[PDB]
Design a binder for this molecule. Structure first.
Ligand SMILES: [Ca+2]
Ligand SMILES: [Zn+2]
Length: 182
């Protein structure tokens, strides 16, 4: 078993412009890649858990997501950040795409993506961390039994509720490794 950092994507790793599904619009947040490289060095498995409802909406296709995801994966690996896992939820209850229109267990606040990652990589949850910019990220982490829940200021201004749920509030994923050391 290994400890892990569960990573929310939009607003945590990349700037949230809304329904980002293009390489052209994918901008990595400052210091996040270096921090991810460092987090890995420290010994954490790195797992991305992202809700991608735009797929259900028909904003962008599933294949489009994969193309961005592969690129993201390559860009990181090239920087010596090798991601342990990447999980996503394409569903929404009101989705206009029939294939993806449903209630599901993988859509945060639901803890399914995290549980799925845990069984696959044999992660030790109490030792783990969750970093996100939204309350659902915190809620999924609590459900999943993650030890420390971290909120970040890289999204839209954080709600009091998300803040209530969080264990830590940090400026960026960039500041996580230092935070863990102290
Ligand atoms: Ca997010
Ligand atoms: Zn789902």
């Amino acid at each position: 078993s290994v400890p892990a950092i569960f990573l929310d994507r939009d607003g945590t790793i990349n700037v949230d412009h809304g329904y980002v599904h293009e390489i052209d619009n994918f901008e990595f947040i400052d210091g996040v890649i270096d921090a991810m490289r460092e987090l890995k060095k420290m010994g954490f498995a790195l797992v991305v858990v992202t809700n991608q409802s735009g797929i259900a909406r028909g904003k962008f296709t599933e294949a489009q997501f994969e193309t961005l995801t592969e690129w993201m994966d390559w860009s990181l690996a090239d920087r010596d950040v090798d991601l342990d896992g990447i999980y996503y939820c394409p569903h929404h209850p009101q989705g206009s795409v029939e294939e993806f229109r449903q209630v599901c267990d993988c859509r945060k606040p639901h803890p399914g993506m995290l549980l799925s990652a845990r069984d696959y990589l044999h992660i030790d949850m109490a030792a783990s961390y969750m970093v996100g910019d939204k309350l659902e990220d915190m809620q999924a982490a609590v459900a999943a039994n993650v030890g420390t829940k971290v909120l970040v200021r890289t999204g839209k201004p954080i709600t009091p509720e998300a803040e209530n749920a969080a264990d830590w509030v940090l400026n960026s994923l960039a500041d996580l490794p230092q935070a863990i050391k102290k």
